[PDB]
């Protein structure tokens, strides 16, 4: 198994140093949010986590104060046998206007409509177990959950760190040799499709065990459907 | 060849399908493409209830893949591009951008086409249209046939964001001060209607109310965000008012008062710089709390320009002059610059604002290399001791000067940034030379492209 190797080497900060060929492709950019009203004079700062496939992180895009209210609400509702340990929730915007406010901000961010995504995830994580590689977008050989939601496959994801992790917790891609670092307040983002509608095998991914303190993550998958006009194809692939 | 009710378009039967339809919804598509598989069965579905209705609307299809030339005049970069043409005008196609639903689409070409002004047959139809919106438009005709009715009807047709009436009941004039023929703009802010005034002309009717929609001073949210950015008014006025300000009321209405000379030339904004919401917006501005209250002014007329009063008092006649000589193209553009520090020269590396940037950069005898770079960037802060490396080997070079710039808080009119970082050299000429560095960020990297001249 020189796959687990990698995968551990990876969540150990190890692996794939970057080239100064791949480095010079990333940076940093005041987010004009593909010229939403809101950012284009309220800028988000965005940076280069990766060149291909493109994965950002943005930065300030929760308060402290959000980010507890969040984890209140969400708390009670987090608690075959499961060897991964972690707990999760799905938040409603009704449950309070800041579920509503985050909602709206990503979409903001993204450019992609949130009317078809799914409830705000959000999971906290424990010590230990193992998180194993996996695409965020299924299989549609697969009898699922999104042939009965009819919004299509989850065409990109939304990642909000919302706890400062002591050690460990890195999200993992290990096709790319990327590890991308916890940050309270931030967001990761990348697109699980292409341009075309097809998965990107690009994007495996798995998130590193927590090796000291408790990871708190809120996830949102944006669908297919209803970004037709928002992220329309491109020529061939 | 018709499949499923939509017409299949190819070059060689597009001018003849334009000619014979008068509503035509074409789409462009690809049969790879997932968004384009997924509307097929509802763009059919849309096809076939037109038909059904007897609607003379008819929808088609051209895949761009075989018809490319004819994809290309259209402008065609993305799947499903739709384009809907009337009269078969080909000159300006308009895009089609609400939802993928058969109902959306159906929706949005009887809008179009329908009735420019929804008939009011009385006064409870009148205020269920006036309280539908913020801001709703009155046609007061006895003959909605009459020439004047008919350009009120073409101003209407030119308005989408406004919901449009027409009336020719007598009760509905009455109802306040109309006598005769005329029109009515009603609005859920200031004066509450505004009557118009003047020859019922099409061009007069619209400047009327472009002067009118709009809310004279307007509070900055994320609410009233898209309302403010979504107009066609490309020039605005923001003033940062904190509410723990003396004389709050006062100030505001000192802005209000010099708003009225503008209405539907420079839109007027105000925000609460003390509300931790509104911080990505005073840093945009290289603002701080301690600086505030201030007024600033800008065009997004494609390259989105700064300018800020030579004056900071904050009254009527101060905020009036300063629109004026604004519009009059007395006021240069406002360009960030931070204050330059003591010690800027201090150092191996040379520290740049704003102020300093033009007088540095382009100096005739000096080989300047520039790293523009912001504070919070992660790719800067591992750029940095390669940075400061290069500065301490070329300290004492005759010519060669290294310096660094923050690029958030400082804006320069001879270099434009948009990525961080990003590196600039100026060789030593009068001719204001600028090579951009598109190498490996390495110290070896630096000095072969350096010791080059800028070439490697």
């Known amino acids: 198994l020189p796959e687990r190797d990698v995968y551990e080497s990876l969540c150990r900060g190890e692996g794939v140093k970057l080239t100064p060929r791949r480095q010079k492709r990333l940076f940093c950019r005041y987010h004009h949010g593909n010229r939403a009203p809101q950012l284009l004079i309220a800028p988000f700062k965005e940076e280069d986590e990766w060149d291909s496939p493109h994965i950002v992180r943005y930065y300030d895009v929760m308060s402290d104060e959000e980010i507890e209210r969040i984890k209140e609400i969400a708390k009670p509702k987090l608690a075959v046998a499961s060897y991964r340990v972690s707990k999760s929730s799905w938040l409603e915007e009704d449950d309070d206007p800041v579920v509503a406010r985050v909602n709206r901000r990503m979409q903001h961010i993204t450019g992609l409509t949130v009317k078809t995504a799914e409830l705000l995830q959000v999971a906290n994580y424990g010590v230990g177990g193992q998180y194993e590689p996996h695409f965020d977008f299924s299989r549609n050989d697969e009898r699922d959950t999104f042939k009965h939601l009819g919004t299509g496959n989850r065409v990109a994801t939304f990642l909000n760190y919302m706890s400062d992790v002591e050690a460990g917790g890195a999200t993992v891609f290990p096709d790319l040799g990327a590890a991308i670092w916890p940050k309270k307040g931030t967001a990761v983002f990348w697109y699980n499709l292409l341009r075309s509608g097809e998965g990107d095998y690009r994007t495996r991914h798995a998130a590193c065990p927590v090796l000291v303190g408790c990871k708190w993550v809120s996830n949102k998958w944006f669908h297919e459907r209803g970004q037709e006009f928002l992220r329309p194809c491109g020529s061939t692939e | 060849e018709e499949e499923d009710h939509v017409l299949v378009l190819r070059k060689s039967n597009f001018a003849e399908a334009l000619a014979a339809h008068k509503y035509l919804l074409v789409e462009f598509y690809a049969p790879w493409c997932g968004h384009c598989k997924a509307l097929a069965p509802e763009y059919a579905k849309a096809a076939g209830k037109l038909k059904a209705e007897g609607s003379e609307i008819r929808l088609a299809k051209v895949d ?135 020859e019922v002309t099409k061009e007069n009717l619209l400047d009327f109310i472009k002067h009118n929609q709009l809310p004279l001073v307007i509070e900055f949210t994320e609410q009233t965000a898209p309302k403010i950015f979504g107009g066609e008014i490309k020039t605005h006025i923001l003033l940062f008012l904190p509410k723990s300000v003396s004389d709050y009321d006062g100030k505001l209405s000192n802005f209000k008062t010099a708003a009225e000379s503008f209405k539907g030339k420079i839109l007027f904004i105000f925000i609460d710089s003390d509300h931790t919401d509104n911080q990505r917006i005073l840093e945009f501005f290289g603002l701080k709390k301690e600086e505030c209250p201030a007024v600033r002014l800008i065009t997004l007329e494609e390259e989105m320009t700064k300018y800020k009063p030579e004056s900071e008092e904050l009254t009527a006649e101060r905020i009036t002059e300063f629109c004026h000589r604004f519009l009059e193209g007395k006021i240069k553009p406002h360009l960030m610059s931070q204050e330059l520090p003591e010690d800027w020269d201090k150092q191996p590396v040379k520290v740049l604002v704003g102020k300093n940037f033009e007088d540095v950069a382009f100096d005739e005898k000096k080989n300047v290399f520039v790293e523009f770079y912001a504070p919070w960037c992660g790719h800067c802060k591992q750029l940095a001791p390669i940075w400061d490396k290069l500065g301490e080997t070329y300290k004492d070079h005759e010519n060669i000067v290294i310096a660094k710039m923050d690029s958030t808080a400082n804006e320069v009119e001879a270099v434009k940034v948009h990525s961080f970082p990003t590196l600039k050299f100026f060789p030593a000429s009068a001719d204001r030379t600028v090579i951009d560095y598109n190498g490996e960020r390495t110290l070896d990297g630096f000095k072969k492209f350096l010791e080059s001249g800028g070439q490697d």
């Open chain 2, 64 to 198: 761009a893949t075989e018809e490319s030339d004819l994809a290309q005049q259209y402008g065609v970069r993305g799947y499903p591009t739709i384009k809907f043409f009337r009269n078969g005008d080909t000159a300006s196609p308009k895009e089609y951008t609400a939802g993928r639903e058969a109902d959306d689409i159906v929706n949005w070409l009887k809008k179009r086409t329908g009735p420019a002004a929804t008939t009011l047959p009385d006064g409870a139809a009148a205020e269920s249209l006036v309280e539908s919106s913020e801001v709703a438009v009155i046609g007061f005709f006895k003959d909605v046939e009459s020439d004047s009715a008919k350009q009120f009807l073409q101003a209407a047709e030119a308005i989408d964001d406004i919901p449009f009436g027409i009336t020719s009941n007598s009760d509905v004039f009455s109802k306040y001060q109309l006598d005769k023929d005329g029109v009515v703009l009603f609005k859920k802010f200031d004066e509450g209607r505004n009557n118009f005034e003047g």
